[PDB]
Design a protein around this ligand. Structure first.
Ligand SMILES: CCCCCCCC/C=C\CCCCCCCC(=O)OC[C@H](COP(=O)(O)OCC[N+](C)(C)C)OC(=O)CCCCCCC/C=C\CCCCCCCC
Ligand SMILES: CCCCCCCC/C=C\CCCCCCCC(=O)OC[C@H](COP(=O)(O)OCC[N+](C)(C)C)OC(=O)CCCCCCC/C=C\CCCCCCCC
Ligand SMILES: CCCCCCCC/C=C\CCCCCCCC(=O)OC[C@H](COP(=O)(O)OCC[N+](C)(C)C)OC(=O)CCCCCCC/C=C\CCCCCCCC
Ligand SMILES: CCCCCCCC/C=C\CCCCCCCC(=O)OC[C@H](COP(=O)(O)OCC[N+](C)(C)C)OC(=O)CCCCCCC/C=C\CCCCCCCC
Ligand SMILES: CCCCCCCC/C=C\CCCCCCCC(=O)OC[C@H](COP(=O)(O)OCC[N+](C)(C)C)OC(=O)CCCCCCC/C=C\CCCCCCCC
Lengths: 49, 99, 140, 225, 101
């Protein structure tokens, strides 16, 4: 067998949430794009009023 | 004579942009070379003065109308450069030498 | 001669308030006819100058086009409201313009464009004394 | 050294940097979206512009002759003229301003806590300088090692270093004086202090010696073409 | 000129290549475990040269300085421009009558 006296500190955990990290990355890049469009639109509207 | 706020702000902005870019690049280079400890920090200072020399070349002659004095060329935003330098240094030394 | 070059020329001609209405209206018409989609919202400020030049140039045909585009894009906008006011003043229609400016003022009191346009109307009518009095009151 | 797992780079090193960068962008864009100019009535903007004119006069009245300047003084601070004398007058706004001030740092600390939970138990990167041993309890959260070199850092403090070292990049790409970082109300007192200050101010017509300083050197004329 | 921009690109590319080389060399050690503890002269020279050229390009890319004296850009502003007052435009001039209505 193998023993981990320090709880395997230098290895990625087997229960890593890939479907959460990738989801937050690719649902937050899209959020950045959407909020950039919103900021541009609001800035233009405020300029024109 | 008559300083204009927009022009001095633009000069400060371009100097800050150059300093930030050079500090980030110096962090990347120090991480590439694997410098560790004090020997790394000194390199940053060296990089800084190199940039200063380049800025001295960029301002060149007749710089008196560009800045009140050469001082912001040398020590302009040094700590802001150092923070990004250490960040990029850790980044590159991590993804090059650690693994 | 690329659309970026005339765009920069128009930007310069806007930064310093020039009144060569013929040249600016020609360049603006070329930009909004040939390279309208070549760049984004940066033509929209152009759509201001282009109509003003038109009112200066007398070529009212594209003034309605620019005004309709701006209004359909920006409903209930004080800037477009002042722009409509200038369109009305182009044909000396003064009562409706005054009413529109009063409506703008009652909708927003801190607006400065309406007061300037109304005193421009007053000085166009020749009432110089009342225009001077209105400017003195406005500066207060 | 340490033979760190390669998969720690593709999922604990790069994602932290990406998260920090785009969270900073998100924070700046949310900050500009939230900012709305408070409605101002005629009196407040009028008095603010009046004191603006007074301050610019105090700054550069040297280019104006003496009689015009002391007439300005009579108008501003003198009983007889009347100006500066007959010119005076959980809440939602406090909660809103407190929340706006809070939202500049607290989201970063909450992201740090979430990262510390999510990525607990790793060794992400080696800080290339020998940090002190007394800094161990906060750099190496979630590690049970004892003799490990202090230069090895867990995920939370690596994210903190990333968020500290990325503000200059934000100023580089986002624009000058961006809002993504980590860091008059009363006119009567303003009226009185302007009164006293412009009382204390003097006059020095800068045109008293312009001709003599102009006569000394010939006028620049090249480049007329 | 615009080529400066292109220059900086290749500089970054050069730096990127250095990274790859360094990574490979690290693998070298991770398979040799000898008392070398030294980077190849080629990779460090390449990294330093790439740094120098990239910084020199970046200095140009930063832009052009602007003069502090306020009478610099205002020198060419003739009086025919400052008088226009765009907010106070009047359209009761000979332009409309002379030109096509
Ligand atoms: C798991 C894939 C890459 C796509 C990312 C796009 C996300 C995004 O839309 O974020 C935009 C950012 C910043 O905007 P920008 O630099 O592209 O434009 C100039 C900025 N502006 C418009 C204010 C002048 O782009 C960036 O940082 C990406 C470059 C790093
Ligand atoms: C290679 C290493 C050389 C670095 C030397 C350096 O750091 O640069 C020093 C000089 C800047 O001082 P200055 O001698 O021009 O006199 C003062 C300029 N003033 C009269 C406007 C105040 O820059 C210069 O070499 C002038 C560059 C002119 C290029 C032709
Ligand atoms: C599905 C996955 C969710 C997609 C990613 C969620 C999008 C978050 C983007 C965002 O809009 O969030 C950024 C804020 C910025 O900070 P702020 O307070 O200045 O703007 C907020 C203003 N306010 C306080 C009034 C809300 O920071 C935050 O809250 C970040 C909150 C951290 C929680 C991570 C979520 C864990 C995944 C589930
Ligand atoms: C190996 C490590 C090196 C790290 C790389 C960082 C240094 C590399 C930098 C610059 C080289 C690109 C040169 C292209 C010319 C861009 C500037 C320019 O003269 O052209 C103008 C346009 C638009 O001007 P602007 O308003 O957008 O500029 C901001 C204006 N100002 C500076 C006053 C605030 O520029 C544009 O096309 C829009 C794009 C502006 C530049 C985008 C580059 C920034 C993107 C990523 C930086 C780092 C993010 C990821 C790193 C994470 C690692 C921790
Ligand atoms: C500056 C960027 C650093 C240059 C890359 C240096 C490097 O680390 O080079 C080695 C990797 C080759 O890793 P591999 O796929 O053969 O083993 C993976 C084993 N597995 C498939 C089981 C996960 O190549 C790579 O570019 C590393 C890929 C991630 C780093 C690039 C992201 C920055 C842009």
């Amino acid at each position: 067998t193998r023993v981990y006296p320090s709880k395997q500190f230098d290895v990625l955990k087997d229960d890593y949430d890939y479907v959460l990290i990738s989801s937050v990355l690719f649902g937050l890049v899209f959020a950045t794009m959407i909020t950039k469009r919103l900021a541009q639109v609001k800035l233009l509207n405020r300029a024109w009023r | 004579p008559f300083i204009s706020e927009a022009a001095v702000r633009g000069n400060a902005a371009v100097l800050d942009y150059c300093r930030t870019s050079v500090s980030a690049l110096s962090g990347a280079t120090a991480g590439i070379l694997g410098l560790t400890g004090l020997y790394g920090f000194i390199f940053y200072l060296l990089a800084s003065v190199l940039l200063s020399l380049l800025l001295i070349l960029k301002a060149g002659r007749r710089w008196n109308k560009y800045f009140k004095s050469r001082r912001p060329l040398f020590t302009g935003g040094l700590i802001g450069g150092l923070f990004t330098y250490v960040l990029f240094w850790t980044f590159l030394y991590g993804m090059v030498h650690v693994y | 001669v690329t659309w970026e070059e005339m765009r920069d020329k128009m930007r310069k001609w806007r930064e310093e308030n020039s009144r060569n209405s013929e040249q600016i209206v020609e360049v603006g018409e070329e930009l909004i006819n040939e390279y309208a989609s070549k760049l984004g919202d940066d033509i929209w400020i152009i759509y201001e100058q282009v109509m003003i030049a038109a009112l200066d140039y007398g070529r009212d045909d594209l003034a309605l086009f620019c005004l309709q585009e701006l209004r359909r894009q920006f409903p209930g906008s004080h800037r477009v409201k002042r722009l409509t006011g200038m369109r009305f003043e182009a044909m000396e229609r003064y009562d409706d313009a005054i009413q529109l400016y009063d409506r703008i003022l009652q909708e927003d009191p801190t607006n400065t464009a309406a007061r300037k346009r109304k005193i421009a109307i007053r000085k166009a009518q020749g009432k110089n004394v009342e225009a001077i009095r209105e400017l003195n009151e406005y500066l207060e | 050294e340490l033979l760190l797992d390669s998969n720690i780079r593709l999922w604990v090193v790069l994602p932290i940097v990406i998260i920090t960068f785009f969270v900073g962008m998100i924070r700046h864009y949310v900050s500009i979206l939230l900012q709305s100019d408070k409605k101002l009535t005629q009196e407040q903007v009028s008095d603010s512009q009046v004191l603006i004119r007074s301050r610019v006069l105090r700054e550069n009245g040297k280019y104006i002759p003496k009689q015009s300047f002391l007439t300005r003084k009579y108008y501003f601070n003198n009983p007889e003229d009347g100006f500066f004398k007959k010119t005076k007058r959980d809440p939602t706004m406090l909660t809103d301003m407190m929340k706006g001030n809070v939202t500049n740092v607290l989201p970063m600390i909450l992201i740090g806590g979430w990262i510390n939970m999510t990525f607990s138990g790793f060794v992400t990167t080696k800080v290339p300088f020998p940090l002190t041993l007394r800094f161990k309890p906060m750099l190496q959260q979630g590690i049970e090692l004892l003799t490990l070199d202090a230069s090895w850092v867990s995920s939370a403090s690596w994210y903190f270093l990333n968020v500290f070292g990325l503000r200059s990049i934000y100023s580089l790409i986002l624009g000058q004086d961006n809002a993504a970082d980590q860091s008059p109300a009363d006119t009567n007192k303003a009226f009185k202090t302007e009164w006293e200050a412009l009382e204390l101010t003097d006059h020095q017509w800068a045109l008293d010696d312009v001709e003599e300083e102009l006569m000394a050197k010939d006028l620049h004329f090249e480049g007329m073409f | 000129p615009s080529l400066w921009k292109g220059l900086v690109g290749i500089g970054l590319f050069a730096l990127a290549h250095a990274a790859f080389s360094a990574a490979q060399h690290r693998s070298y050690m991770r398979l040799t475990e000898k008392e070398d503890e030294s980077l190849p002269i080629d990779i460090v020279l390449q990294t330093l040269l790439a740094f120098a050229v990239t910084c020199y390009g970046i200095v140009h890319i930063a832009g052009e300085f602007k003069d502090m004296d306020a009478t610099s850009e205002l020198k060419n502003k003739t009086f025919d421009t400052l008088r226009n007052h765009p907010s106070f435009y009047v359209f009761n001039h000979r332009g409309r009558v002379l030109f096509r209505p």
